[PDB]
DNA sequence: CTTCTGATAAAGC
């Protein structure tokens, strides 16, 4: 490895005095998968890698460098490990509902499929038209606004529009005639924006095309917006935030600049967690994709690289083919296959290699295998290795806390290494189980645990 | 069948009374809490296994968050003993086992840091889901005659000490092999005899069969059978 | 008179029907085990110790068989004097330099137009 | 390999001085598969073979040879390897929509589950009729023209037909009367083509069968065409 | 092998003077499998076996013998080996579509991708009816005419019936009424045979059972038929 | 009286229930190990060191077993005086030629007329 | 004439 290409975070297990470095360029553009049994030290190994990546500064300046790391925290550990970082829990993070790219907007609001037609187009027509109403730029790019375009629309006018078309009344000439405080108006393309207001009364001889057909649809729509689970995305805080401040929040480019961004998704439900993982994975990927094509036309190199750390990837990217894992898997898989070119790579952390999907986990060209006692997990590590050097996998069950085997394109030979101790460790200390059992029967405060459990 | 969860008693009791009942923190305080689910059907056994495991894990999770606010570690650790784990957490990917498997898997995957760990008992290593046994650092093995099970124990060991699995079929009663970070070297041990043992002693077939034809009182058995 | 040249970093996801129609195969370093299993089964020829040979191929090293070459050979393909545009983001080298200012408005304006 | 059939683009790995040729006729006349991992050298290998392919000329002439290679460059990366070659970007490239067959036309315009079956049929009927009207060959092959057959058709005229069918006014005898500047005509197979004009007015005492149904379908089609 | 049974097409590899005969009867009434790699020589082996089997005669006559060999030549290579033989390419060969069975007719026309049952029933019903019309034999085997039976049917009439069933009309009496030059009839199995003509015009009140769901089925059938 | 001759370059893709109905097997140079292992199981007889024999067969060299032959023998099939020749496009011969102009205009008018 | 009810149907899964 070239001397100016060396990135070390560990030393050899057999000889402590020799440090084992990896090709620092090749370590991060080719995806990292770290696996090992429970309590093996994956979180400390991940934190030690990102700590050395933060302090990896070229000579000639003072201040924080160009590292960009996003950590998905489901156990709230790396707040302590990175004190000068930005932590974004669900109660304080705002991800707007107008940043959905259409496919997830289709899935977020509609729990139905295979039969909704009249409920479908009135949903997409309301959103697409409301984006042109609230658009404040030149009209040349107003016409190119579509359902998947990331422009602000009011969801409360969208519900008002669908609840109005619920109450349609046509006239003997077969067109819907409305009436508002300015006067009666035909329901047409240039007059469809007036249905966004609640105070419209229809005048008609007969019921309209969608009269009484969206009463079930509006109730499902209203009883999803006021979910406090989705208050980070569908709440009132997404109203006053814009596209720009969303990106400064995700990669810590705001008033507090940090190389590490941590998202506290610790005790949230899965449906909140699956929305959080799939949104930010797509948003970071498309930011890296679009910043790449800006740099293509400029023919310049001021690109920023982003690494996303996916701890507990079995929660949101498992091998199982369930539909509740579908939207989260596809966002991470897109980063796994195509994300390497645009500057968005992933750090995959899980406790078995055989539970993460093969379309995601086999795209990782570097590997940090800690202790694995499962015969199916060891066979995965053996088959990633040629049979000449496959005998080093025999030491996997004998690995105690701190050692792992690093293989991949970024390292010369696969070696059992000792990951360097974290002087600023994450908050994942092993509980001294017997020493906490020799004490008194301590009176656990049940009231304090319950009234947080209740709000959680 | 669901009277324990959907009965009239669910109205009266509170959240704090339930948590105190499950870990014996009530008026009668005990180190050991036993859930006697002996004759219940699977559909209410899987409900009991999955809900109590979820409640205890989230109690351990929320206790740690309270302790982390005061810059403290978790005060009370909880160990859950899953006896006869093949009934609710098997290798099979059937949909009936899904809720009970996922609750125990959450404890196995994530309960180490939250103070909720598990002791899992079953006949064979191969009849339990691999997700739970892979996370078990300590692995105690009694006599194992099935060759698939013996090779499963063999791969858990390093190859230098892997020859100790050859005494697995000849293991006597109370003779165990203890592995993991707890023990210095994997070794065959003799578990200390229980002065107060579980009431699961083998019944002497020849001693019982040598006596007279017993009347068996079918009315009392059927009366109990019909209640269950 | 219309023939194919199929280049793919994951040969396993290519359909077996179209991949079988190929007659000359250039096999570079194949680290993915499913890519190894797929290629070795569908290769028209074999070489000695091919299981360890495919991961061990160096950069620009190839294994060529087919009916256009008599002996399956390990070949060091000559370097491109005029190389194609290579996308190799040096994450360490870009992370060592100072925190660069991001033109978010330029990126977002192209993102919103898409 | 014969002396005139040799195509050398590589050299032996163990012996650098030895160059390994392939049968150049046999190499390209049968399909080639270049597989490898990421960064193995596939794109440089593809560039090297094609660079040597265009340099294979007979000594008699100067200028371009008869090699014709088309690259589906998904990463916009082969322009540097072949600077003199023609490159077709999205602004540069021009594919006519009418050369798409029936399945490709449907996937371009129509949507999964977002289109009713009657909305789909008027789309298919308009295109398969517009292909016949803009056909300028002999009329013997007009009857064999279908929706799948690729012939030139005006997609804006297709919009006008669909927009007119959205404004249809049915008569008392379940047919549609249409008024044009030439005159009034009942819609049938013989005069369906006069709906491709924009300036056609419907005459009827009642709303047509497809009236008010394709208005949603018009705006989705116009959104597709005017999308830049 | 008896000398009259001998059939020699090869000689021993190690001794060229030893010609290896096979039992020429037994070689051919039991199936032959010639396997090899590409470029091993199995096309030449097939050609040499058949040239040896064509020029073998009783020598009591002058002329062609009784060999009957059919080659499914997919590479167009055996024309050179047998110049005096009959070669049938796409331009020369005519294969009747009505000798196809039901599975082959489904594979030629239907697609398993869409797998629409409603296209499948009308397709089988049209052909099975049309095979009964064009059948000139005795009535006692007309009732066993099926979709799978190898009898002549008109594919343009089948398309015409299928296109007509896309134009069905539903009346207040829930019968389908059609108008023809011969007369006016109801959609009965006796009267369905006059839907095979294109010159019919439907009469009714509302849309029929199969209205609007066969146009994509007609266009794909018409795409196959008018494909050159 | 309707028998069949199977000539395949990938024997391991043939279904086992059809390939086992054949009695006489003319096994030429088999080179893929999957086709070698498939054929060796369903062959009615065996020969000495058939594993190394099959990829080592020379050009026209074959191996015939079955009811027809007495013993499995390595044979040289007789050379075809009138060989089966396929009209194949010589790419490097055509690509070495000058760039052709007259032919492209003739192809388009043929495509348009039919 | 329009409204409402009820029945038939088709769905996707
Ligand atoms: N290099 C190391 N040297 C010594 N102890 C270490 C080292 N790395 C980690 N540890 C210890 O490992 C313990 C548990 O490690 P963790 O990283 O929390 O386990 P884990 O990998 O997160 O497994 P799960 O599935 O998340 S519980 C910590 O309390 C550390 O003290
Ligand atoms: N014949 C060769 N000799 C030496 N180095 C080579 C050779 N071929 C490729 N390389 C090196 O390989 C690097 C990247 O190779 P590429 O061909 O661009 O990657 P690839 O094989 O196409 O994989 P992807 O998935 O397309 S990034 C180049 O920058 C060269 O340094
Ligand atoms: N019995 C034989 N003796 C000598 N040469 C042969 C023999 N059989 C085939 N060949 C040569 O082998 C080449 C392979 O041709 P072919 O039989 O078409 O291959 P394949 O087995 O792939 O069909 C031919 O060019 C021919 O000259
Ligand atoms: Mg962890
Ligand atoms: Mg490339
Ligand atoms: Mg051949």
Numbering used by the authors:
A (entry chain B): 116 to 571
B (entry chain C): 344 to 571
C (entry chain A), F (entry chain F): 458 to 571
D (entry chain A), E (entry chain F): 116 to 343
Sentences copied from the publication:
Here, we biochemically and structurally characterize a two-component defense system DUF4297–HerA, demonstrating that DUF4297–HerA confers resistance against phage infection by cooperatively cleaving dsDNA and hydrolyzing ATP. DUF4297 encodes a protein containing an N-terminal DUF4297 domain (a putative PD-(D/E)xK-family nuclease) with predicted yet-to-be biochemically characterized nuclease activity and a C-terminal domain (CTD) with unknown function. HerA, widely distributed in archaea and bacteria, encodes a DNA motor protein, which can hydrolyze ATP and translocate along DNA. The enzymatic activities and anti-phage defense function of the DUF4297–HerA system are activated through supramolecular assembly.
